Homo-oligomer: 396 residues x 2
């Protein structure tokens, strides 16, 4: 606690349903606000933070905005269809809760259970990665799913102990789960400063966690494809050339990620990555060779749509659901599933197409995609004195 000024009772009156009626809620940002000051300093830090200066973090969201829509007109759109298949499941929606370690932190009672409950409770059901570090037992989780259609997914951090892993691997292949997400981006953890900052007060490879095997490789991989039947997605790719390495070692999926930028500041945003990639995957003919996935930044229908439009087999969010959960639990979480589904939906029509398959790039103004500028330090001295036009008054 101990940033926990008995103010846990500012927090308390807030949680203490100060929260609005879970349907006054309007977008994913709404969750996130309520989250930011009801959760614990400690939880909120863990969750919110990002690598160092938190550019890549923020950059991932913004890069969506170099991208604008060319939409399509007088296209009959009474009915739109928004579903698609991932790793040959077929899939309500085309986005996916994703793997968000320690939810017991903002959901003490329920944890990532409240998540699955969430992705299955509702007319809509969506996938789920299960962090290799949940607050819960894979079993404890994998069991609170209602619909037996709800799909489910293992993200896994290899180990040091090629044993413990070779165990969980099949331990989980035992319990159901339709694939493997190996999270390569995370040999060390990143220096998530908002965390450290209260984990006290309020040659140092102390920040390589040894759950993660900092020594992972393409062998260790081309291995594990053999030690299993499940498919494999390499979560955390960060360039073109690595992508091709999955393509060649012929694995299955990829996520273009950087862990919500919690990893390395000045990593690019995945949407940039996607965008340069996909088209190369035309000219090699590894075109269908590989499902590609994208994450982080994602807060709107539009975001998602854009991703798709660009190539994504499927798009992932963490935080949003992560807040969702921690304060309406599984209900919160499914409203989320609800929310984001509608944005996908209305936009789809205003966009002029009816199947996710119909989502091709030509629907995108992609001409500014690389306008990723840094302006010059505006002029302190002159702005300070300058003074602007003013609006007419009102009387007396």
């Amino acid at each position: 606690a101990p940033g926990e000024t008995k103010e846990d009772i500012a927090r308390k009156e807030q949680l203490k349903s100060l929260l609005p009626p879970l349907d006054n809620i309007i977008n994913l940002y709404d969750f996130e606000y309520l989250a930011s000051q009801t959760l614990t300093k400690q939880a909120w830090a863990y969750y919110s933070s990002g690598a160092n200066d938190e550019v890549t973090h923020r950059e991932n969201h913004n890069a969506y905005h170099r991208i604008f829509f060319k939409p399509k007109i007088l296209v009959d759109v009474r009915k739109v269809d928004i579903s698609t298949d991932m790793l040959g499941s077929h899939v309500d929606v085309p986005f996916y809760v994703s793997a968000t370690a320690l939810c017991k932190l903002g959901n003490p009672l329920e944890g990532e259970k409240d998540v699955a409950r969430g992705c299955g409770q509702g007319v809509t059901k969506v996938p789920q990665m299960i962090s290799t570090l949940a607050s819960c037992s894979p079993e404890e989780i994998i069991e609170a799913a209602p619909s037996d259609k709800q799909i489910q997914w293992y993200q896994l951090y290899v180990n040091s102990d090629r044993k413990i892993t070779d165990d969980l691997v099949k331990n989980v292949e035992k319990l159901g789960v339709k694939a493997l997400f190996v999270t390569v981006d995370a040999p060390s953890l990143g220096q998530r400063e908002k965390d450290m900052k209260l984990k006290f007060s309020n040659g140092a490879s102390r920040a390589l966690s040894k759950f993660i095997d900092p020594s992972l490789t393409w062998k260790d991989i081309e291995e594990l494809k053999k030690k299993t039947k499940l498919p494999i997605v390499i979560k955390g790719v960060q360039r073109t050339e690595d992508v091709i390495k999955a393509a060649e070692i012929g694995v299955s999926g990829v996520v273009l990620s950087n862990q919500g930028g919690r990893q390395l500041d000045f990593s690019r945003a995945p949407i940039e990555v996607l965008a340069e990639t996909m088209p190369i995957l035309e000219q090699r003919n590894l075109k269908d060779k590989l499902e590609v996935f994208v994450d982080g930044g994602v807060r709107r229908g539009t975001d998602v749509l854009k991703a798709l439009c660009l190539g994504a087999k499927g798009v992932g969010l963490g935080r949003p659901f992560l807040y969702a959960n921690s304060c309406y639990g599984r209900n919160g979480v499914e409203k989320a599933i609800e929310i984001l589904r509608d944005e996908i939906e209305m936009s789809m029509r205003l966009l002029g197409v009816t199947s996710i398959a119909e989502l091709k790039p030509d629907l995108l103004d992609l001409s500014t995609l690389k306008a990723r500028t840094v302006g010059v330090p505006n002029d302190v001295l002159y702005n300070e004195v300058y003074e602007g036009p003013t609006l007419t008054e009102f009387e007396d």
Copy 2:
């Protein structure tokens, strides 16, 4: 210093009569000195000694200059003779508090070990924030400011942000190696301490010495380039320095009295510093507004000083080269052609620097330069003729990294070690070091590489290097009118 002479005598209200900065005598410690000559030529504005002339002064001189100061820069016969008795009070100078207010107590008692534990600091920025609350309205002023509209200084840093990474994945990075080597010696870390002047302002007490300490003492250890305008002597800073395998570099401002210089050099070469970095981007003293803005709440070329000689020229560097065994580095190059010229005279390296924005506002980011330049160095088959350095504005290891992949042999920080030393002294400095090295190692890891030679342009997303932008000066009236959307509530 001292002198004594033997002979002369003198007086507690008749040398009170030279105050006219035309005719200038003063009394320092025991002794009396004719100024009139050196006046216009004295590093920190000339000015401050018009405004104090015909006094004692020790208040003012003592705690902020180098020792052997007199007995280096003045002739044996300005060294006039003893004061007999003293002088009366105003007519012996209280030092030296431009803008200070019995508030060096909001200050004092903030320093009031009120300052966090050194293990609390997490980046370079916090030193600077601390520093900024504790240092002296001038110590802050001076350390912190840059020329003019302060634009090259922010740009030096911001420029790093138009570079992004392309990291390598699945690479065994259990062990990584940030050491590298520089200019002949081999080094622990790929970056150094640039020279800063007067640290005794922020560390009134050991100044440049605690820096030498902070980079010698720990297990990771680092190159200190020493300023020709240190608060301490070099002798001091060099027999200050705790470690043997520690390494120290001299920065030269060449005097107009090319002798004084030639002695500086031979002497430093004897305490075996290891390189000389001749700083060339200060023929005039650039103009540091916030620092001026002090005096005034209390020429045309009052910015020259026979001290920093403003007429040094490649012939001069080429003639330096023959009087010395130390490798020469030219500090403050700002574009590709003067880099090649250095190459063509075969000096042994250059620093791309613009002194951290203090000199010429609208100098470039030395990052951007280095980018444009290095490849050029290739196409002239003049690749490794030349070690390239780079400074200004570097605040996180990713920065350092970005420069290394770019070709830099090495990178310098200035203020952060200053602010660090200032608040915290030698552990301050080391602590910084440590902070930085960790960042580097850690990101060097995330990037998918294990040693410094594997940093390379193939790791960088350069595609928006050049995107320095200026946005159209935009829309007070509309912005004023637009109400943006809004997040939901909680319920009273």
